[PDB]
Design an enzyme around this catalytic site. Structure first.
Site, mmCIF file in Angstrom:
data_model
loop_
_atom_site.group_PDB
_atom_site.id
_atom_site.type_symbol
_atom_site.label_atom_id
_atom_site.label_comp_id
_atom_site.label_asym_id
_atom_site.label_seq_id
_atom_site.Cartn_x
_atom_site.Cartn_y
_atom_site.Cartn_z
ATOM 1 N N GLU A 173 0.840 -1.210 0.000
ATOM 2 C CA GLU A 173 0.000 0.000 0.000
ATOM 3 C C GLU A 173 0.863 1.244 0.000
ATOM 4 O OE1 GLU A 173 -2.820 0.090 3.210
ATOM 5 O OE2 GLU A 173 -2.839 2.304 3.284
ATOM 6 N N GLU A 188 -3.663 10.600 4.232
ATOM 7 C CA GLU A 188 -4.443 10.107 5.370
ATOM 8 C C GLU A 188 -4.455 11.283 6.337
ATOM 9 O OE1 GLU A 188 -2.654 7.071 7.980
ATOM 10 O OE2 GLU A 188 -4.621 6.080 7.845
#
Ligand SMILES: [Ca+2]
Length: 357
Positions: free
Chosen positions: A154, A159
């Site tokens: 990933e 975020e």
């Protein structure tokens, strides 16, 4: 013509090279997609650029994972209108969800319904992905990220838990953008690594909160071993094999590398300082790479592959109520959820390029 036509590409294609737009992957979201409970593909005109669900398995079958913490991803929490992708969160009165808390036992919190989408065109290095996004003014996570179909590798673009909360309970996190990636061992031997150095929580003097701000944020996935992060056209972080460079709050570059781990094999743990991965100071990226003996990609060899990215990835955009936030009650409260605008992630556009000579 595209929304981003006037916007310089901040990543360097390299000497002799230029950036080629990946047309099928890219989307400036200027069409209408009305929300639906059905799992459907969507895009402009005839184009299928996305589907309104978390990403399929490698074999094409659905992955029915419904989200972390008390998150429940919902098909109808995704729309395109007004020039933006809209992905929002809501709660149903009395609905709760159980998840494993920090004591390795179940706990329950109010369930947070949220949208999640996957792009139909995968990406792989070398590739640059950038979005213009209004971060949610919410303690929930505003997420733009890349995930291999098999869930082992990933790379995150954004975020961010951008809202401090109406009582400021999330003020510490609201001022930062987590510049991150993950590597996993899948069950049975489940393990998760992500950057936990202080500098991975990136910020800028004079920005108290990202929630409600519209920013451009992108990652240049250069190679198996190098990632570069950009915010508002400025390079702000590089991860390169076993070393890191990041722009400090005043804009100045700091070069760092891991000070220690308990092991570089699968049961290894980080040595920490002040609650974050302990890092040493170097004087350039090459100096840091010379000094370092610990991967900043896969320090514990979870991938067993030379500690590198190696797999094509799905582009995912979503909102999440993560376990750590929910356990700590940093998740939205009822008063905050009364303001819809604050709970709706808006992506004006996402563009994808590859370098060509
Ligand atoms: Ca747009």
């Amino acid at each position: 013509q595209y929304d981003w036509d006037n916007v310089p590409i901040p990543a360097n294609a390299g000497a002799g090279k230029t950036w080629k737009l990946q047309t099928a992957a890219s989307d400036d979201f200027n069409y209408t997609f009305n929300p639906t409970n059905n799992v459907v593909d969507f895009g402009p005109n005839g184009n299928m650029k996305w589907y309104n669900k978390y990403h399929n398995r490698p074999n094409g079958q659905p992955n029915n994972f419904e989200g972390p913490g008390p998150t429940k991803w919902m098909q109808n929490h995704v729309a395109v209108s007004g020039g933006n992708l809209n992905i929002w969160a809501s709660r149903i009165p009395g609905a709760t969800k159980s998840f494993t808390g920090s004591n390795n036992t179940p706990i329950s919190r109010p369930e947070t319904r949220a949208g999640c989408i996957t792009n139909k065109t995968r990406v792989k290095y070398p590739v640059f992905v950038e979005a213009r996004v209004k971060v949610m003014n919410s303690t929930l996570a505003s997420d733009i990220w890349l995930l291999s179909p098999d869930d082992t590798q990933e790379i995150d673009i954004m975020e961010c838990y951008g809202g401090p909360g109406n009582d400021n309970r999330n003020s510490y996190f609201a001022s930062k953008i987590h510049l991150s990636h993950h590597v996993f061992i899948r069950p049975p031997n489940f393990k998760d690594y992500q950057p936990a150095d202080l500098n991975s929580w990136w910020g800028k003097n004079g920005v108290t909160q990202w929630g409600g701000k519209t920013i451009r944020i992108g990652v240049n996935w250069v190679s198996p071993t190098r990632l570069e992060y950009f915010v508002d056209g400025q390079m702000v972080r590089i991860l390169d094999n076993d070393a890191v460079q990041t722009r400090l709050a005043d804009g100045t570059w700091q070069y760092t590398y891991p000070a220690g781990v308990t092991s570089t094999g699968v049961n290894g743990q980080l040595i920490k300082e002040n609650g974050y991965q302990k890092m040493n100071i170097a004087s350039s990226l090459s100096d840091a790479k010379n000094k370092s003996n610990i991967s900043v990609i896969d320090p514990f060899n979870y991938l067993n592959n030379g500690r590198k990215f190696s797999k094509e990835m799905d582009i995912i955009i979503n909102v999440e109520d993560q376990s750590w936030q929910a356990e700590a009650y940093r998740s939205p409260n009822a008063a905050e959820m009364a303001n819809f605008y604050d709970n709706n992630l808006l992506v004006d556009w996402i563009r994808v390029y590859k370098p060509v000579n």
